[PDB]
């Protein structure tokens, strides 16, 4: 037992808009918009941003591979485990 466990952390898979996979690399509240945010490294060019948002930098990807979105909002890959 994990105990616990209430978002994602840096360096995690999670899956987007429940279909779009790509690694996290900042976590917390950013400068344009208020609210803990969670970026996220797309895998594939179908994102916004590219690490920079209107300006504000954050991390460092590659274009079209980076998107910013609250942890609710994101899933653990594409299975969807049960209790038994």
């Known amino acids: 037992?994990?105990?616990g466990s209430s978002g994602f952390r840096?360096?995690?898979r999670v899956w987007v808009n429940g279909n779009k996979?790509?690694?996290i690399q900042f976590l917390g509240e950013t400068q344009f918009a208020p609210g803990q945010w969670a970026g996220i490294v797309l895998d594939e060019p179908i994102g916004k941003n590219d690490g920079?948002?209107?300006?504000?930098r954050y991390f460092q990807c590659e274009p079209l591979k980076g998107i910013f979105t609250r942890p609710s909002k994101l899933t653990r890959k594409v299975s969807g485990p049960s209790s038994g």
């Open 10 to 12: 840096v360096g995690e």
């Open 1 to 3: 037992g994990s105990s």
């Open 52 to 56: 920079s948002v209107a300006g504000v």
């Open 21 to 23: 996979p790509g690694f």
